[model samples]
Target: QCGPDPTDAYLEAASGPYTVSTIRVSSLVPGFGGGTIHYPTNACGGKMAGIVVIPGYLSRESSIKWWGPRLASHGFVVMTIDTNTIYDQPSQRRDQIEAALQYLVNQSNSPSSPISGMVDSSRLAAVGWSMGGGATLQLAADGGIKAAIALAPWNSSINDFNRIQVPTLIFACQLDAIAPVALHASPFYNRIPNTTPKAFFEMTGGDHWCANGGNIYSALLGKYGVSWMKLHLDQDTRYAPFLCGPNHAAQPLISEYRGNCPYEN
Candidate 1:
């Protein structure tokens, strides 16, 4: 699934070599509440990969805001969005994510758009927390997405994980009371077909919000999230080793892991 192993330097920090900038997009998309777009400054050399991030049930864009700058620093055009309905179901969230992606693609091609020509429309991914995490899976299963990352995802009405065609990563919280690993994350990971590239990292003694904002585990989360997105969405083989190598095993926060990727061993 990846090329050569990533070096320790690539895995240690935000390695995109660019500063970041952000802008707000309000009411531009019909079905979404609004969104914040984060991109690299002039330092980023090429059209950037894109990702749409959604918050969990009753959660707002702030809950997932950490990912915008983190991913943007790594040369990705990241959008953290809010749903029209804060408590919307997983299926509704999925629709919002799709709409958000289209909005970004349209903006990238719009002559008057701030992000015009800055994004690689064909290279896109989805990410979410909790219920939004479940929505991320639903979006991936539905197709057209290149990758997905679900953080402590909750169970949703959609159960067709076997249909997922994109590479996916699931971040599980071992001590999560809201969405227990055994009941939600584990089954979600287990149902996905082995043919699809996937990985699960269960954070030791961490709660559902452990991966939110800039928490104690945020650095490690950023490392893995950036690597996964780079490897799949941007097809940056330099991130392959970080995903498939044993470097993550030494991180004290990760308790258990499972998956079927070339670097999982």
Candidate 2:
């Protein structure tokens, strides 16, 4: 379920040549949610991929907004959204994420839509932090998307990972108190079907919010984030080395890695 393969230039830094912009949009899909959309000023002659980013419980878009400018600057149309309620469950949050995808797809095809014809509807992905991260797993389980990224994900129940078909990446905070890596991220990574490509990254000495907002490791997170999307969604093979090679070994913050992909080796 991967795409063609592009160069790895955007993996470590912003990939797009154009500047980024942001706009607020109300959800057209049911559930009464809205978000901030970050997009490139120009597509640079290519259809852009789309990503729906959801914040975790008790978290607002601002908590995860760092992904907006970062990913958009790298040539993605990113929508960081809020849930109808801050206490929404993982299932409820998953519904909102799917709805946002529909909204983006609609806007991409509408003649009056600001992003009309600029989005590659066929290329879609999802990202979430904490509870939202669990929801991201559910979305991937449902299939159809290109990839998923979960940061400090939290879930109480065991899910059938055999149903997930897309590439996935999970970022675990080594010192996270709210959702300890052992109980949450580790099991999630271990249970995911071996047939599907997946990776687990442990942020040494980090807390639950280490990857949020403008934290110290945000750039490191973005590097892998954009690289995974580019490799799977954009099908750019140039990123293969980063994902499957020794690049990550040089990262001082990420203490551990587990995956079936070439990167794990």
Candidate 3:
């Protein structure tokens, strides 16, 4: 489930040069079957980091494609994929994501792939939207997904909270009904262990899809997302606010809210 036609135009206008590549990965999990993988084109000539992005409810390949170019613009070899089922089945989604990464590593190691020698396997991050956001936490739990960013992530199981060991950044919409700030983001944040570096961005008047495609609202979200990727993926310390604090209210549309979900207390 993608957005309107103008969404593409808006995304292109908001992002820079990036290529979109598609491939299917074999899933070891049963019932839900296989998944789709999306790879973003690199914008700069510098070495690129690998990112695996997962989409949420009613979301399709195109829904998260915009992020590819945005991340690629910041020098990341981004990959977005479909989940095993509609909900958060960690095992299925995890395997699928691993398969995609293996494929990327093979390509990066291959002489024919564009990213040969350009893709940095050591620096990797995973990102997800809504339901997909929850899975990023699951992937991170295994100690394989080095870093993660969740955009309006929803339906995260209570047990999954403590499993996250990587540096994670969450972007939540203040007005999102599906993943209410109070119910999902707040609670999730409250339970996270201090051993991990985690942050939450409460976007004012933002919705579930607000961070997906490009728009006036998405422009704000895009900036934060791009900023975070640069800091964590690119090893540039200048854009650190997108990941951890020293909260900087540089934009009127966005602000930082740091506190765990009240439920945890």
Candidate 4:
């Protein structure tokens, strides 16, 4: 059992069953600016999967901080990071995410760290917002990952993600002026090969910050995010029903949805 159970009420809740704690990372880190790590105190099974979440250009970790504990409480080691500089583009953001993953590995190997022995280093995922979202796809293309979730992704070389085979979930905001679905999210999602497990979720008339959190759509948003990670990273088929097919595509909040569903795992 990856989590408690699959229920709308539980998935929509602000938090999951496991108690969560936070540890701050110093900005002095070499590869990327530092942020916070949120991890569950109790073991859901054995070691938990790791997830790295980075913010977009001109954005701080605070923009994506909500996902830290929200994801960790659901049996994950979630790292919400800031770029070396707020101005870093997607290319550099990808590097920062890589370094962040290494940092998490360091913590797991350290017996003195609070997260020691808690991370399943081999089972890792990537998540990002805006420019960081595009970088998430790049990381997936680079290979060696269990899952990826991109939010309003923005990258000039969007076609570069064509090689991505990772199971990816792209969240698009219908009204996003910075990274419109036509130019960014849609194109990015379309580029991912059909052979891989993929899905595109468009938020009806939401702004670029919609997936960044803080809105009436928070509950449903978390349900989709947590469910995707659970299904792919933890290999929990019980969470599959929440993702495959038209689970909530009919809801007014979602503008559009696309995927090669009936996922085989």
- 1-265: candidate 4 lDDT, tens digit per residue: 5557779889999988889999999999779899999998874568889999999989999999999988998889999998999999777999899999998988899977888998888889999999899889999999977899998888875356888889999989999999978999998888888898998889998889989767877887899999999888888898888888555678889989998888886
Pairs of colliding residues, candidate 2: 3-235, 4-235, 5-235, 5-236, 5-237, 6-236, 6-237, 244-263
- C-alpha positional error of residue 58 in candidate 3 after TM-score superposition, expressed in Å: 3.2
Candidate 2 wrongly placed segments (more than 4 Å): 1-10, 13-16, 27-29, 247-250, 263-265
Between candidates 2 and 4, the one scoring higher on TM-score is 4
State the lDDT of candidate 2 residue by residue for 145-173, as single tens digits.
88999989998767865578789999999
True-structure lDDT of candidate 4: 0.88
Stretches off by above 4 angstroms in model 1 are 1-10, 14-16, 263-265
Residue 31 CA displacement from its true place in model 3, Å: 14
lDDT tens readout by residue for model 3, 126-213: 7777777766666777788667788787764565777677767788787898988789877776677776666677877788776675
Ranking by TM-score: 4, 1, 2, 3
What TM-score goes with each of the models?
Answer: 0.92, 0.91, 0.76, 0.97
Report the number of the highest-lDDT candidate. 4
The count of residue-pair clashes in candidate 4 stands at 0
lDDT of each: 0.84, 0.82, 0.64, 0.88
